[model samples]
Target: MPQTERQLRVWIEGATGRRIGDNFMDGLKDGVILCELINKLQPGSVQKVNDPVQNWHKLENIGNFLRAIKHYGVKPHDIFEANDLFENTNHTQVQSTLIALASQAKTK
Candidate 1:
């Protein structure tokens, strides 16, 4: 999982051209980075990635990313819920979603 975390980090940073913080979970926890990533993968996917200030806005960003990825062709079962990352309750499925997203990015 750590390796996949690393791979996801590298892939996201590479796509978005920005370095995430040391902690993978926290880095993406805000969902700003994720919105940027999906936007890079599919232009204008998330429309406007909100600033990481409000709790609800952050969740909205995560939800937007999930919606974009699903529209981009990821299976419904592969997508993770906003709380999975926002609340830090499900790293495994979060990682799975990112891994699936990375592969989806590859074929694009």
Candidate 2:
């Protein structure tokens, strides 16, 4: 689990040129970084990333990321729910979602 976490963090940081420090889940909990990462993978994918303070908007960013990656080719089965990532409810699922995204990233 730790191995894959580092790999995804490295891949995301490399692709987005952004730092995530050492806390993978906390690093992406806001969803802003996730939006930027998706945008880096596919320009204009998320379109509008906000440094939002409202919880709704933060979830919006995560949902936007879900939609963007779906269009980019991650199957529904591989995708995770908004709360799964936003609430940090299911981190393994979150990692699986990112794993699916990373595999798709290889094709792009």
Candidate 3:
């Protein structure tokens, strides 16, 4: 198992409730990635939701991501940011769709 260590900002307490100190830490594979994230943020901030034990793909929870809609946690509003991110803006027979989806639309 590849081992790693880092200085914690403050005292850490076990989730079940216990104080911690300078202690040796070790882990292997994806487990190391988890540790890396924890060290980067608030101590013990990372929560094990699914806790995938096998391939990392198991962590790819579709429900965990957001969509383009405001209700889907996209942004203040997806429609207002109409500059486009190099997205296709080619006009089609369905002119109504282009008018509604894009900031600018053909009036004629």
Candidate 4:
């Protein structure tokens, strides 16, 4: 079944692994977490996102994406579907882990 808006928000929080806030700090932190995950799986295949300058841009994009969805009522599930497709294309376990983590983190 598809996720509701609240569920989507929670999923984004957990998958992205950041607290909602005004600053880009959260995105930077989340990017670090993502980089860690990538490195753990690929062992040095991931690099740019961990770089300070590059990570800043990555965080900015995440912030922009979140803002667009939260404030503008964009279809977040659709966005998530596309992101999942692109990011987890050949990695079923990673995809499932992300989905499970997000679902479990949903606010009651």
1-108 in candidate 3: lDDT tens per residue? 111112211212222222222221212112223223332332333333244366452222111211122232224332222212112232221122212322221121
Residue 69 local lDDT, model 4: 32
Error of 1 at 97 (Å): 0.9
**Candidate of highest lDDT:** 1
25: Cα error in model 3, Å: 11
CA shift at 91, candidate 2, in angstroms?
Answer: 0.8
Candidate 1 residue lDDT tens string, 5-61: 668877778876768865677767787778987887888988788888877888888
Q: What is the C-alpha lDDT of each candidate?
A: 0.80, 0.77, 0.25, 0.39
Give the TM-score comparing model 3 with the true structure, all chains together: 0.19
Stretches off by above 4 angstroms in model 3 are 1-26, 32-45, 57-108
Query: RMSD of each candidate?
Result: 2.2, 2.4, 19.1, 11.9
Ranked by TM-score from best down, the candidates are 1, 2, 4, 3
- Which residue pairs in candidate 1 collide? none
Ranking by lDDT: 1, 2, 4, 3
Whole-model lDDT, model 3: 0.25
**Tens digits of per-residue lDDT for model 2 on 1-108?**
335566877777776676776478866777777788888787887678767587787777888898888778998677777877777888877877888887777778
Once fitted onto the true fold, the runs of candidate 1 whose alpha carbons sit more than 4 angstroms away are: 1-3
